[PDB]
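Fold this complex.
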Amino acid sequence: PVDVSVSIFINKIYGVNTLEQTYKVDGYIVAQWTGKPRKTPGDKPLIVENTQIERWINNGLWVPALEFINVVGSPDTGNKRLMLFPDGRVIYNARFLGSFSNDMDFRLFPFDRQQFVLELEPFSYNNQQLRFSDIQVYTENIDNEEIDEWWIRGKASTHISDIRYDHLSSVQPNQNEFSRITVRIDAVRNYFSYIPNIILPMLFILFISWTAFWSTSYEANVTLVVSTLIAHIAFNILVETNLPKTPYMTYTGAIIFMIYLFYFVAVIEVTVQHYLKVESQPARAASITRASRIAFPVVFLLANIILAFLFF
Amino acid sequence: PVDVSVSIFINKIYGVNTLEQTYKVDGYIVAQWTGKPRKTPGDKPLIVENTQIERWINNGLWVPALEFINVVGSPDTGNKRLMLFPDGRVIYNARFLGSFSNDMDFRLFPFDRQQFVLELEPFSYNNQQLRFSDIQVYTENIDNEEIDEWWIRGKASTHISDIRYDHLSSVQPNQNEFSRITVRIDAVRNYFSYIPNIILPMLFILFISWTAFWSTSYEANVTLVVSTLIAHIAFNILVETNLPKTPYMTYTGAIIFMIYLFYFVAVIEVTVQHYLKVESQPARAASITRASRIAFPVVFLLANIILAFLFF
Amino acid sequence: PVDVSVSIFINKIYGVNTLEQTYKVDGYIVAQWTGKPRKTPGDKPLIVENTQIERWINNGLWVPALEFINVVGSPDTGNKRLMLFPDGRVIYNARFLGSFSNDMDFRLFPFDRQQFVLELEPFSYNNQQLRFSDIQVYTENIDNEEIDEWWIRGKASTHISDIRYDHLSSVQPNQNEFSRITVRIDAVRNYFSYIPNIILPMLFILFISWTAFWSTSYEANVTLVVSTLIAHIAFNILVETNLPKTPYMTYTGAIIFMIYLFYFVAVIEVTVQHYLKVESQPARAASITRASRIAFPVVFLLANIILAFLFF
Amino acid sequence: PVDVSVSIFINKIYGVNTLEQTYKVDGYIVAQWTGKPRKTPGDKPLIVENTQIERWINNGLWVPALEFINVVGSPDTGNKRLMLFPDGRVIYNARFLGSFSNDMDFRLFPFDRQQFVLELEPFSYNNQQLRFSDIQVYTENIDNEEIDEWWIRGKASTHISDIRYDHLSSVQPNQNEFSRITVRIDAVRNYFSYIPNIILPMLFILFISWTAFWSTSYEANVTLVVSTLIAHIAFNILVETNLPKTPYMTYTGAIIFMIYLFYFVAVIEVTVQHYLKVESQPARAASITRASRIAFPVVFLLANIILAFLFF
Amino acid sequence: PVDVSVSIFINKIYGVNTLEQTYKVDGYIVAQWTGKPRKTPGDKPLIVENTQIERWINNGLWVPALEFINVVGSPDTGNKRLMLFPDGRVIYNARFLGSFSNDMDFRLFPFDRQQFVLELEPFSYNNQQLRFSDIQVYTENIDNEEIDEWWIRGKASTHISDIRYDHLSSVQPNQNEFSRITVRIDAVRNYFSYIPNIILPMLFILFISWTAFWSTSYEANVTLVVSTLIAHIAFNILVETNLPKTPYMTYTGAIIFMIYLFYFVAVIEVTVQHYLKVESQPARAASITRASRIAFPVVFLLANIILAFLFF
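Structure:
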C-alpha cells in the first residue's frame, strides 16, 4: 500500500445551479507519495512540466489515477507539475476547474443551508492508501460578507474512508476496499438582498389587493384585485431567475402558491359584497367587507407562521 | 467469436430535453473479454492507464471498438483503464458522460411515463459476441423521492440482441449480424410540485373570469374577463420553460387551448347579457347569466373528463 | 482517377434554426475506394481503428481528404474505421454529427416547405472521381408522423456533379474540376400543433376586441380594444420562440402586422362612436358601430384571402 | 524577403453581435509562397494533408505563422492542405471559421451602414513581404436580397500596408515593419422587415394614446394613456432582441425615449383637462384638449425631423 | 534567480459579468529571459513556432511555467513563438484570450468605478525573479468615448511583488517567496445612455401614478396607481439584463425598492381619500390629497438625496 498525502487548495466555489444541483470549484491539488529513489541532476530535485509529464511515464515512471468521484464531465486541468525528488518521493501539483454534483435541499430558500462536497478515489488502485487530507479554504469569508453570495462557515470537513464495492472482478477477498477523500465545505446563503428585492415587493402588491376591503364600488374593486394578480405574476416573472425551482415543494413556493389563493379568495369576497347589494341584502355585505378587512391579514399571518412551523 | 462481459454502472440520468428528446447519462463501463495469454511482472496483473493504453495498441494489443448507437455527439470519456491479466483476459474500465437520444412521449405531461434507453454495439466487429449485460442503477430512488425529478422504477431492463444490417460490404453471408446491448431504465415524473405551481394557479385565474356570471355591470364584467385572459397569457409565459413543447397535441396543451376558448366564450356571454339589456330584453339576459353561472363550470368539468377519457 | 463509392446513412436531422438557416445531422459515412494490393494476416481483411488509422498513413497508406462543403464549423467525427482488404480496396466507416447550412425559405411558416442539403467534395483531390452516391434515410417517417417535427418525404435526392472552380493555382488546364456529391432530403413541417397553440388563440383575442361593435359605453369599449392589444403583444411574446424570424416579409408576419392595424382601426371606430354622441349626432354613431360590426370581420377575411392569394 | 501570394475566399458573414461588435466569417485561405526546390514522386507535385503537415515541419519544412490580427479567440481551422511543388513554391489551403472584431456604428439602425474587416499579419516574420491580396466574395448578393440580412455592396476592399511597431526587441533599425493584409467588405442592412414589424406597430400604440384628445371622460382617458404605455413597454420587450443596444445614444433609442415622454406629457394633458373641469373652468379644458389634438402630432413630427436632421 | 522581462500588450477588455465578477481580456504576452548561449543558423536568431516549441523542450530547452493566478479556466493561447538568440536570451511571444476574476463593487451602478486586474506568477519557480512589468494599453480611450463601454483611465498600474505562501514542501524555508506581476487597469462606466434608457423612463411611470393627487374619482385613481405599478414591473423586466444584480444592496436597488413603496403608499392615500368621502368626512380627504400632492415629490427628493448622501 503506497501512502499518498493529498492537500487540496480551494480558491472559488461559484455558480450554484438550482436545477442540476451543480457548482464550479477552482483551486489546486497536491499529491505527495513516496515512490522509488532516482537520480536528479546533482542534489536539487527535478521539476517536470505538463508536456514532459507523459514522456516520463513512457520511460517507466509511476503516476496514480486520482479521479474525482462527484465530477460532472472531465474537469479543466490547467498546468500540471511533477516534482521528482532524488530520495524517492514525488509531489504532483495541478490547477483544476470543474463541475461537482451533490444532493442539495432548497426547501428553505430565504435562509438556505448548503454543503459543497468534493470526493477523490484512485480510479485504478484499491490497495494504495490515502495518508492525510488537507483543505485550505483560505479565501476569507468575513472579508466581504455582503459581496460573497455564500457565507463560508468552517474551514471544511476532512473525512478519509474505505469505500467498499460489490460488483468487481474474480479476485476480491481484500480488493473491494478503495481509499476515498470526502471534503465537505459548509455555507449559508445571505438573505440580505433577497428580502428588499423579492419578498418585500411581492408582499406590497398582495396588500394593495386588500384595499378593496374598504371600497364600496365593485367596478373599482375588480380593477384592484384583478390587476394586482397581473402585477404578482409579472413580478414573479422578473424574480423567477433568482428563485430556485426544484421537483419538491418549498417554503417560498408554498407562500407563492398561498398568495395565488389570497387573490382568488379576495375576488370571491368582492363578488359576494356585490351580489348581496344586488339582491337587496347590503347589511350582510357591509359586515362581510369589514370581516375580511381584519380576517385576511390575520389568516395570512397565521398560515405564514403555520408554514414556518412546519419547515422549521 | 470473442466473448465480452459488459457491466455498465449508472450514476446520474439528468437534464431531460423536451424538444430534442435527449438526456445526459453518467457512470462507468466495464468490458471483460478473454484475450490471449501474456506475461505480467510476476504473478500480479498489469494496470495500464489512459495515456499508456494507446502505447499498448501500437505494440500489438487488441482493443475492441465498443460505440454507443444512440449517443448524440462524442461522449466524454474521463479516465480509462486496461487491466491485462497473465492468464489472458482483459478488463476495461472507463468513466463516461454523454447525451443519449430515445423516442419520448410527452402527450400526458402531468403524469409522465418515460423510458431511458442505452445501446452498445461494436463499431467494427460482428462475429464478436457480447456475453452478458449488467446494469447497476444502485443510485437509490426511494431515498429522496421528492428531491429526485424522476422516480426510478425497476433496476433497468437487460436485453441482448443480434441486429441485422442490409447495406454492407461484398462478403455478408453471415457478417450482417452484430451483437447489441439494449439497456432500458424506466421512470415516472413526480407531479408533486407541478400541481400547486402550474395547474392550480392556471385554474384560479380562469374561475376569476367566471365571477362576471353574477355581476350585472358590463363595465366591471369586461375588466374581469379581459384582464384574466392577460393574467392567463402572463402566467403561461412564466410556466413555458417547465411546460414540454412538442410538434404533437398534448393533454396539457389541449386543456391550455380549451382555457383560451372558455375566455372567448365568456366574453360572448358578457356581451350578449349587455346587448339584450340594451335592446329592452333583460328577461333573457337575466336567465342567460344564471345559465352560464352553472353551465360553464359543468361544461369545463365534462370536457376535462372527455380529454382525460381520450388520453387515458 | 481513383473511383470512390460513397454511401451516407442518415439517422437524425434535428434542431432547425430559423435565423442562421442551420440544422444538425447525424449518421455514418462509407467510402469504398480501390487502392493497391496489400498483405493482410492470412486471407481475412485487416480491421483498423481511429487511433491506429494515423499510424498507417505514416507508413505509406493513402487516405483521401473528403470534407463537407456546407458544414458549419468542424463536425464531430466519433469513431472512424479503415478496412484494408488483401485484394486492394479500402472501406472507410465514420460516425458524424455536425451543423449544415442551406438557403431556407420560411415565407410560409404554417405550411412550411424545406430542403435539407448535404455536400461532399474531396478537399485536396480533383482528378479523383466519386463513383456512386447512396442515401439511406431508413429512419421511418410514417412510423410517428405526430412525434416527428418534419414529415420526411422521399428517400432523398442523389446528385453527382463536377464543380468547376475559377480562382486556383498556376496549373489548371484540367485541375479545376472536382467531383461533388449533392444529397438533398425533402420535408414538410406539421401544422398539427401550430394552429391550436399559435394561430387559433391569436385570433380569439382579436375578435374579443370586436365585441365593442355592440357596446354603447365608451369607458367599457376602451377597456376592450386597449387590453386585447396588450394580450396580443403578450401572446406574441409567449409564441416568439416558435415563430421564425427572418430579414424578409412572411405570411405569418403579414397577418401579425395586419392584426396590429385592426386594433388601431377599431380604436378609431370606438373614438368616432364617442365624439359623434358627444357632438349630439348619435344617429351616425349608431350606424357607424353597426357598419364595423359586419365590415371588420368581412375586411379581415378578404385581406387574409388576399395575402394567401399572393403567397400561394 | 519571402514573397507570399494570399488569396482569401469568402463564403459566409453571419451572426452580427450588436454588443461585442463581433461577426462569424467562413471561407478558405490560400498562401502561395516560393520556397526551396524539393523532389516530389515523379513530376507531379506532392499533396500533404493536415495530420502529415506537422510531420514535414519536423523534417525541416518551412511553414509561416500567418495569424489574423482582428480574430476573437483561436479560429476553427477545418482541413489544412500543403501542396509541395518540385520547382520550389508551396500552396497552403485551409478552411476557417472564426469570430472577428471591428468598430461598429449602430447609431442609425433602421438604415444601418456597416463594414466587415479582416486583417492578416505574419505573427513571427516582418522582413517577409505579402505579395498580393485577393478577396473572392462570390456569394451572390442580388441573388436573394430579401433572404440575405445584409446587402453585400462591392467585391470587398483590397489593402496591403506595412504596419510599424514601437515596443519590440533590441534589434529594430528595420525590423519594426510587418506586412499586413486589410480586407474590408461593405454591407447595408435591409429595412424591408424592420418597418412593418418594429417601427409601424410601435407608432400605432402611441397614436391610440392620442385618442384621449377627443374623449371628455377622464375615467376612459386614464385607461387609454396608462394602458398604451403598458403596451409600448410590452412591445419593446418583444422587439428588444431585434433592437441593437450599445453604450451610446441611437436614432432608434432617441425616438424610443421621446415616445416615453409623449405618454407622460399626454398623462399631464388628460389630468389638466380633468382638474380644470373640477375647478369649474371647463372653457380652458375644452381648448386645452383641442390644442393637444393638433399640437401632439405636429410636435412629434417636428422632433422626429429634428432627430433625423441631427443623425443625417 | 533567472531574470525574466515581462511585457503584456492589452487589446480588448470586453464582456463584464455582473454576477460572476468576470471579464474577457485579449492581447499578447512577451517573456524575455537570459538563457544559455546556443548556435543559430549563421548570425540571425532562430524563429520557432507553436508546433515546434514542444520539440525543443524534449531536446533540452528550458521553458518556464508562467500561469495567470486570476484566470478562470484554461485561457485560449492562439499562436505561441519562441525566439532563440545565439547570445543566450530567449523571447517568448504568445496571443491570449481568457476570463479573469477580480472583486467588483457594483454598489453605485449609474456612476460605476471598476478595476480590471491581471496577475502572473510562475507555477513552478519561486527563486526565478520577474525583472520588469510593462502594460501597453495603447487601444485609444478618448478616440471613441461614446462607442467604448468603459472609459480607460490611466495607462494601467505596474506592480511587482513577492507573494509569500504557507502550505508548501520540505525543501526550503526560503522557497515560499514567488515573484508576481500585478497589472491593474482602471475604468469608469459611461452613464451617457443609462439615464435616457433606464433612469428617466422609470421615473416618468412613477410620476404618472402621482396624477391621482388631483383626481377626485376613486375608480379613475385605482386605474392610475395600480397600472403604473404594472408598467414599473414591466419596465424593470425590459431593463433587468442591463441592471447589475449582486448579493449586496445597491444605490439603484435601493431606489428601485423605494419606488415599490411609493406605489404602495400612494395606493393607501387614494384608498384613504375614498373611505373619508364614504364616511361623510371629505374635509380631511380634500386636504389629504392636496398634502400628498406636494409631500410625495418632496419626500422622494429628500430620500433620494439621503441615499446619495450615504453611498457618496
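Chains A and C do not touch (no CB pair under 8 Å).
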